Ligand binder design. Structure first.
Ligand SMILES: *CCCCCCOCCOCCNC(=O)c1ccc(C(=O)O)c(C2=C3C=C/C(=[NH+]\C)C=C3[Si](C)(C)c3cc(N)ccc32)c1
Ligand SMILES: [Cl-]
Length: 291
């Protein structure tokens, strides 16, 4: 059984003139656990992880601006927009020290925030995260042609914005098991209108692959260097074959990053939370108890 329900009351905070939605469960005191989704998901991707953590820790899981149940202003949705909005979210809630649980573009936000606030980060659990991809040869072959098309001027927007391919095709292709129509409807909901799909297109165009965009390569290189030197507790989840993090990369990272434990979740692509949520939540819980 992998549940499809989303049993969390909505919470809203005004951020930069916009309303961000977030899950907020678990006890009120202690160090909070901040869950950051990426593309094209929402806090829904955490729905089956949170129940393992909420017994002992506050769980905060925002919807990135432009996604989930957060407001959808008409922005460019550059990565820097997300940085600013997430910076504002974290300050609006008065968070001081945090534990990060981060995935895909949420990992770029989390690592970049950690680099800038190293004293406030007590631990980082991460999976299928943004790292530099020097050559397309490192991108999974089955996925290469479409992601190259996503990163084109016209074809890319036709696929993602007009035809909604990132939601209808790429998202299920990021899960080994078949996503159900109930799960798919939850993921479709925020993007039923083409005009709301800009974030879905800007994100693959900011992936640091083969040196571009250079400014994002730089930012990602910066926080990977910080991660290699930081003593912060680290917990890495990976699967086979993965997408961003293939098994060989995961093994390398388990040796090169300090204080890093790596967990094999079995078959997985990008949305590892959808293929083995029970292992991922139970391991985060036991890791949290030893911090
Ligand atoms: C932060 C990183 C996030 C990583 C997410 C996972 O990424 C890896 C998966 O991407 C693999 C390739 N991506 C595709 O989007 C893809 C590949 C092939 C095809 C195809 O069948 O032609 C499509 C495609 C599909 C695929 C499945 C569908 N239903 C389950 C529906 C489609 Si439609 C009819 C919307 C479609 C239209 C067009 N014009 C091109 C391709 C597809 C997608
Ligand atoms: Cl992406």
């Amino acid at each position: 059984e992998i549940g499809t329900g989303f049993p969390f009351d909505p919470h809203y905070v005004e951020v930069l003139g916009e309303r961000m939605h977030y899950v907020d469960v678990g006890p009120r005191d202690g160090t909070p656990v901040l869950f950051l989704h990426g593309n094209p998901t929402s806090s829904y991707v955490w729905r089956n992880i949170i129940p393992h953590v909420a017994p002992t820790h506050r769980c905060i899981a925002p919807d990135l601006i432009g996604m989930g149940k957060s407001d959808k202003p008409d922005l460019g949705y550059f990565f820097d927009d997300h940085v600013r909005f997430m910076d504002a979210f974290i300050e609006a809630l008065g968070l001081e020290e945090v534990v990060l649980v981060i995935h895909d573009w949420g990992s770029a936000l989390g690592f970049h925030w950690a680099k800038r606030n190293p004293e406030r980060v007590k631990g980082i659990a991460f999976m299928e995260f943004i790292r530099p991809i020097p050559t397309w040869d490192e991108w999974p072959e089955f996925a290469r042609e479409t992601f190259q098309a996503f990163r084109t001027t016209d074809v890319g927007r036709k696929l993602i914005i007009d035809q909604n391919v990132f939601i209808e095709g790429t998202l299920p292709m990021g899960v080994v098991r078949p996503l159900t129509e109930v799960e798919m409807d939850h993921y479709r909901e925020p993007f039923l209108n083409p005009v709301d799909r800009e974030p879905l297109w800007r994100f693959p165009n900011e992936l640091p692959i083969a040196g571009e965009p250079a400014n994002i390569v730089a930012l990602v290189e910066e926080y990977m260097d910080w991660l290699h030197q930081s003593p912060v507790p680290k917990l890495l989840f990976w699967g086979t074959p993965g997408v961003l993090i293939p098994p060989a990369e995961a093994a390398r990272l388990a040796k090169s990053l300090p204080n890093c434990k790596a967990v094999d979740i079995g078959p997985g692509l990008n949305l590892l939370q959808e293929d083995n949520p029970d292992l991922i939540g139970s391991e985060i819980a036991r890791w949290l108890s030893t911090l």
